[PDB]
Design an enzyme around this catalytic site. Structure first.
Site, PDB file in Angstrom:
ATOM      1  N   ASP A 334      91.896 -47.973 -13.886  1.00  0.00           N
ATOM      2  CA  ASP A 334      91.323 -48.432 -12.622  1.00  0.00           C
ATOM      3  C   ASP A 334      92.312 -48.143 -11.487  1.00  0.00           C
ATOM      4  O   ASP A 334      92.792 -47.027 -11.377  1.00  0.00           O
ATOM      5  CB  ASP A 334      90.994 -49.932 -12.698  1.00  0.00           C
ATOM      6  CG  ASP A 334      90.158 -50.410 -11.511  1.00  0.00           C
ATOM      7  OD1 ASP A 334      90.708 -51.105 -10.630  1.00  0.00           O
ATOM      8  OD2 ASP A 334      88.953 -50.078 -11.459  1.00  0.00           O
ATOM      9  N   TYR A 465      92.748 -52.607  -1.733  1.00  0.00           N
ATOM     10  CA  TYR A 465      91.554 -51.965  -1.187  1.00  0.00           C
ATOM     11  C   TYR A 465      91.617 -51.797   0.327  1.00  0.00           C
ATOM     12  O   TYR A 465      90.779 -51.113   0.905  1.00  0.00           O
ATOM     13  CB  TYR A 465      90.319 -52.821  -1.484  1.00  0.00           C
ATOM     14  CG  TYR A 465      89.886 -52.874  -2.928  1.00  0.00           C
ATOM     15  CD1 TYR A 465      88.943 -51.977  -3.422  1.00  0.00           C
ATOM     16  CD2 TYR A 465      90.382 -53.847  -3.784  1.00  0.00           C
ATOM     17  CE1 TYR A 465      88.497 -52.056  -4.735  1.00  0.00           C
ATOM     18  CE2 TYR A 465      89.945 -53.933  -5.101  1.00  0.00           C
ATOM     19  CZ  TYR A 465      89.002 -53.038  -5.565  1.00  0.00           C
ATOM     20  OH  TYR A 465      88.551 -53.144  -6.851  1.00  0.00           O
ATOM     21  N   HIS A 523      83.508 -50.758 -18.163  1.00  0.00           N
ATOM     22  CA  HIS A 523      84.630 -50.581 -17.253  1.00  0.00           C
ATOM     23  C   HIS A 523      85.964 -51.095 -17.804  1.00  0.00           C
ATOM     24  O   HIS A 523      86.992 -50.476 -17.611  1.00  0.00           O
ATOM     25  CB  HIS A 523      84.344 -51.279 -15.927  1.00  0.00           C
ATOM     26  CG  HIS A 523      85.501 -51.249 -14.979  1.00  0.00           C
ATOM     27  ND1 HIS A 523      85.904 -50.097 -14.339  1.00  0.00           N
ATOM     28  CD2 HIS A 523      86.385 -52.212 -14.623  1.00  0.00           C
ATOM     29  CE1 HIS A 523      86.991 -50.352 -13.632  1.00  0.00           C
ATOM     30  NE2 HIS A 523      87.303 -51.627 -13.786  1.00  0.00           N
TER      31      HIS A 523
END
Ligand SMILES: O=C(Nc1ccc(I)cc1)NC1CCCCC1
Ligand SMILES: O=C(Nc1ccc(I)cc1)NC1CCCCC1
Ligand SMILES: [Mg+2]
Ligand SMILES: [Mg+2]
Lengths: 547, 547
Positions: A334, A465, A523
């Site tokens: 990730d 982010y 995921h």
């Protein structure tokens, strides 16, 4: 009634039995039957082998005494010995040939998992041979799966002496009646039996496991493949490195060999690698499982710029510097995966090899702004939701247990919708208050994440982010380069955010790229298909990372 | 006025200069003079080499472009190129041949030591060659000795572009007038000069150092050998392992390669190895400097039996288990030395090799009680003084600074009398209140020990002396064994408690024993003769520990 199981080492947990190499040597060398066995036990309780087995003398000191016995025995038998007969060569070979009897270890693991107290009871020696490391590794791997390891050379007693059995029981804090003892030698079972405990004469594994299954009443044979070894937080070596005045990074370390630095994603921790840490260490690597900046025991400053990829990568280099490592293999997942691709692009000198799970490498587009690009992909809407400081923090922090139970889910489970999160006004707006427990995690494991995140929350994590433009600009500086060091891209079929197709053009920038693909995997790759991950990383590490 | 010194890498801090391999290749290959130099700089600011030096492309991407230039250049020169001409082979060889220019590094170290801000300013590349680790190690070793490392491929600028110089000054937080810049290229000095800063054209080291000495006014040449690198506590990676419910061991870790576990004596700490930690790591080993049980950041339970050698050794094995190490080389000093000899006797499987400083191996005497034996040696009277709980604790804890300043002393200094301590009623009864500072330690270092000991005091440390009978009994169990693994005994001439003669009969129990002896060295061996210790341990490790 039964509450404990004791296993012998040679011939039971390890095969082929080293003691059983004396007969194979006699036949191979065409010597009288039992000649080597006689010399091996020459003198009985007063013999060299018993002294060796009690710890009085070392193995190297023993070897000379066994050769002497071998000559006396042949002498009385009127038979010669080969020209280059060598006891050391015979045992070095026999010992290295001996390996862990997996199905037997599995049965021990299962019984323990169901409440049983397990132990290894073995007659063994103080190994000072130059090849001793081999046996040390075997014992270490086995040792970790039992409650007690009782070695004769350590306690000064040896089977069948009843004293060793009383010691055993004393260590077990249990009475005979509640103990099962497996051995491949009848003489060693008699004492146990006299004391009244259950005993199994182990010849072939299947048969022994059948008796063991019957007497314990627990399914041990024909059982499904178990999950790889996971680690207990409190049994790990914990490391801390200050890479800057207010930034200290924490990591879990295990194993020896080439350095392998694991980098988790959002919103996880070093613990997300619990399944591969023991495995990669066992495979011959020195694993350093990070708590990335912003998580767990690592520092978590509030400023957004503190989490732009340029800074995070620099810190990882300093981390290597401080630890005195010129290189390390970087494996990320990730956001962590995004970080290793950039470590490979800006610090090839420091990366022995690079591997990413789920996260593909896509060179920045000089013409489109990151935000424009993000809006063009429906599934990335949640990223826009993560932008405004404090909003996502409030939702994710309101009920930690719910947050992780809602996130950590297999593909066939109720995975969170990632479509109109901003429009929906939240990430869990359509989620139950008490999410069911995913098959991938136990209640205890969830609570581990819960405690870790009670320290710093989601601000630092979310800040990962909030540097899109900044990371974009930095990335544009590498648009002329290519990844030419060993690299591995592992895709996850059911990862609906980090889709496999997203990596279809990677070879244009990474010509020698090696791949891996996991079927029916969501995921949370490490948790989802731990057995498949370990197999893929180990195979790649041994071929492209160790050299 | 001068406050900072900047050094170029190639040709100044490292020799031979890699760029200077193009001329040596032309002559060796009998090619036109400067042919390779021309192709190397083909295109000037728009050329392949400048792109490479700014970070636009990697070295591996560059190699193909340089070969193309080499053909065009020869083309215009009407000359052919060897059959197996290879740019990669030429640079791999050149780069690996380049090493640290020690006297130049020493000058940098000295200037920095006297207040100067130092930095490296170099035109370099992103190395993705399969041999890249070589350069990484070079940079890492050098990197640690300066305040700033400015690499062109990292900042997107390259000398002589004046922009790089403005960047430099900006990083230095200083004006031109107070900066000295050494380079081996005139063109790269001109910009610096134009800005008004002092510049030195470096050809031969001695001459450059003479100019540098004259302009700075600091003695840099013909200076005495400096002490090896020491470490700063806060720049170290700190590890913690729980080997039992109430026992956690702390250690400092540095380097890669075979594991080397350092075990200090009484009353010290991991910091006592400050001089050999960087050195052994630099030599190719993974160093784990312990804070032995009872000290510093390691646990310190009050019970006496918690410090008997049997327990301490067991914990060290568990320590290895938890860290996932099947083996480790054990090097101890003083009480630590006693501990490694016993690790080798009871756990040969776990010790790759064993080394002891000052502490000899003397097998326990089955007939005489330890206490009887201790009373028979006048110099060991202080040990009897250490027996009664609380007494020695009070004296040693009353004034910590005085305690360490009184203990840590070279042989030619006022070393503490070790004769009639019990009769005298104390250890410092005849010592001044404010001991002078030993040549072996700075005021800051003493205060480091002071802070470490403010946490647990001397109870746990002293308890190491309160298990004589217990350790004696355990030791008697090994009287039949011998040390047959690689072993090293290092004696200290002036250690009046752990005298060299005490180890004269060691070969009887350790046949293959290797030795080392240090002249004019007191008890605090590591602090006393750090340069000699490193040389002895490294030489032994490379021959008997690495294999
Ligand atoms: O966004 C994630 N992971 C993620 C996002 C939301 C949740 I809830 C869980 C994982 N990965 C990033 C990695 C870097 C490139 C963009 C996507
Ligand atoms: O006693 C010391 N060291 C020591 C003693 C007192 C002082 I003040 C400083 C060092 N070493 C021990 C090591 C183990 C065998 C007996 C001697
Ligand atoms: Mg057996
Ligand atoms: Mg130069």
């Amino acid at each position: 009634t039964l509450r404990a199981a004791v296993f012998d080492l040679d011939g039971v947990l390890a095969l082929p039995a080293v003691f059983g190499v004396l007969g194979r040597t006699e036949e191979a060398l065409a010597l009288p039957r039992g000649l080597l066995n006689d010399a091996f036990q020459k003198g009985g309780p007063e013999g060299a082998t018993t002294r060796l087995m009690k710890g009085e003398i070392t193995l190297s000191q023993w070897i000379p005494l066994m050769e002497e016995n071998c000559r006396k025995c042949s002498e009385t038998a009127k038979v010669c010995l080969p020209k280059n007969f060598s006891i050391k060569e015979i045992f070095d070979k026999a010992i290295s040939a001996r390996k862990i009897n997996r199905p037997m270890l599995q049965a021990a693991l299962m019984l323990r998992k169901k409440g049983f107290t397990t132990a290894i009871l073995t007659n063994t020696w103080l190994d000072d041979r130059a090849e001793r490391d081999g046996l040390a590794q075997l014992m270490c791997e086995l040792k970790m799966h039992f409650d007690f390891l009782i070695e004769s050379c350590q306690v000064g007693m040896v089977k069948p002496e009843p004293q060793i059995y009383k010691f055993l029981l004393d260590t077990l804090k249990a009475s005979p009646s509640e103990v099962v003892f497996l051995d491949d030698i009848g003489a060693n079972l008699k004492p146990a039996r006299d004391l009244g405990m259950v005993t199994i004469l182990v010849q072939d594994t299947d048969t022994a496991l059948k008796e063991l299954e019957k007497v314990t009443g627990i399914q041990l044979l024909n059982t499904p493949a178990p999950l790889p070894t996971s680690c207990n937080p409190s049994d790990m070596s914990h490391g801390y490195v200050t890479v800057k005045p207010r930034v200290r990074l924490h990591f879990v370390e295990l194993g020896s060999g080439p350095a392998v630095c694991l980098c988790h994603g959002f919103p996880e921790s070093w613990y997300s690698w619990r399944y591969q840490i023991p495995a990669l260490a066992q495979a011959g690597y020195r694993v350093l499982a990070m708590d990335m900046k912003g998580y767990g025991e690592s520092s978590a400053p509030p400023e957004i710029e503190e989490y732009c990829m340029e800074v995070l990568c620099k810190e990882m280099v300093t981390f290597l510097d401080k630890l005195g490592l010129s290189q390390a293999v970087f494996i990320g997942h990730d956001w962590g995966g995004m970080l290793v691709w950039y470590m490979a692009l800006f610090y090839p000198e420091r990366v022995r090899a690079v591997a990413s799970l789920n996260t593909p490498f896509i060179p920045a587009n000089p013409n489109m702004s990151p935000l424009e690009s993000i809006k063009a992909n429906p599934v990335f809407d949640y990223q826009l939701y993560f932008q405004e400081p404090g909003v996502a923090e409030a939702e994710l922090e309101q009920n930690l247990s719910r947050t992780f139970k809602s996130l950590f889910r297999a593909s066939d489970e109720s995975v969170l919708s990632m479509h109109k999160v901003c429009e929906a006004g939240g990430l869990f707006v359509n989620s139950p208050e008490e999410p069911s427990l995913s098959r991938m995690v136990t209640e205890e494991e969830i609570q581990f994440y819960v405690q870790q995140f009670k320290k710093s929350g989601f601000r630092g994590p979310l800040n990962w982010y909030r540097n899109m433009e900044r990371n974009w600009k930095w990335a544009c500086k590498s648009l002329g380069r290519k990844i030419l060091i060993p690299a591995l891209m592992v895709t996850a079929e059911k990862d609906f955010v980090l889709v496999p197709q997203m990596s279809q053009h990677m070879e244009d920038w990474i010509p020698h790229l090696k791949r891996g693909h996991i079927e029916d995997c969501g995921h949370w790759t490490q948790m989802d298909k731990p057995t498949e991950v370990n197999q893929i990383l180990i195979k790649w590490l041994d071929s492209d990372a160790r050299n």
